[PDB]
Amino acid sequence: SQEGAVHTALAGALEAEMDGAKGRLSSGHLKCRLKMDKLRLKGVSYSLC
Amino acid sequence: SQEGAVHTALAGALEAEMDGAKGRLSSGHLKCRLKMDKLRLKGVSYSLC
Amino acid sequence: AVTLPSHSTRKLQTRSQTWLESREYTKHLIRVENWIFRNPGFALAAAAIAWLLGSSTSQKVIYLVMILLIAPAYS
Amino acid sequence: AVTLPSHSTRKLQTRSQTWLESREYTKHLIRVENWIFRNPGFALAAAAIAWLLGSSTSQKVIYLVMILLIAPAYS
């Protein structure tokens, strides 16, 4: 049945979980450049409370 | 299920086959001394054919 | 079958922990320690073979250690 | 578990074949050859490390072989 020799052969392999036909992984890296030139401050022009 | 892992771990162990409570081995060895002092010859004292 | 290459060779490096991360170091140490504890005389044999090889002391010690690691795995 | 000591250490010797007899030699050779084929650069790394160790040539070749054997098993 070989199903425990593979569980030990898998080591350093990441787990995942599948919903429907899609596979959700929870370990990775994205690289985004954040353009904050249209971010404002909503609070300006308010009066001190 | 850890079973194929044990099957490959058991390399160099002898097979055996059990019928009923008794289990027969198919490899081994024994040492007997043969007392051939009551062995006769059935044939001598027969005339030739 | 029998070989079944280990995946730790191609370990996926991330923030999250991998499949069996708690067991690797203790795994190899336990294999070596168990084999050496079962067969002590090979310590003497390996010490002799290391002494006959290598000029300096450091080379002989390294030979001894590499023999004592390459024997339990029959690598 | 992960360790599972091999029984080929205590191989029972008899006239008849043992449990998995036909597979031992190919087992170890296949493991070593597969690891070396997937990771070729470590041949160069081990050659360098063996050259920096050991005075004579035969000591260096023995260091090379013992490293190239002790790596695929991570023993």
What residues in A contact B11, CB-CB < 8 Å?
none
Measure the CA–CA gap between A16 and A24, rounded to whole angstroms: 6
Measure the CA–CA gap between D70 and D75, rounded to whole angstroms: 6
Which residue type is seen at A32?
A: C
Q: Which of C29, A13, C31, D34 is nearest to B9 (CA)?
A: C31
Specify the experimental method.
cryo-EM
Cα–Cα distances (Å) from C50 to B25, C42, C53, in that order, read 42, 12, 5
Map tokens 């079962």 to a residue. Answer: C38
At A19, give phi and psi (nearest 5°).
Answer: -115, 120
Query: Are the Cβ atoms of A14 and C12 closer than 8 angstroms?
Result: yes
- Chain-centroid distance, C-alpha C2: 19
* Distance (Å) from the alpha carbon of B10 to chain A's nearest alpha carbon: 13
Query: Are the Cβ atoms of B11 and D10 closer than 8 angstroms?
Result: no
Length of chain C: 75
* Distance (Å) from the alpha carbon of B33 to chain C's nearest alpha carbon: 35
- Resolution of this structure in Å: 3.2
Provide the 10 A C-beta neighbour count for residue D75: 19
* Gyration radius of chain B's alpha carbons: 24
* Distance (Å) from the alpha carbon of B22 to chain D's nearest alpha carbon: 20
Asked if residues C72 and C36 have their Cβ atoms less than 8 Å apart, the reply is yes
Query: Are the Cβ atoms of A9 and C16 closer than 8 angstroms?
Result: no
CB contacts < 8 A (A, D)? 3
- What ranges do the domains of chain C cover? 1-75
Measure the CA–CA gap between C8 and A10, rounded to whole angstroms: 8
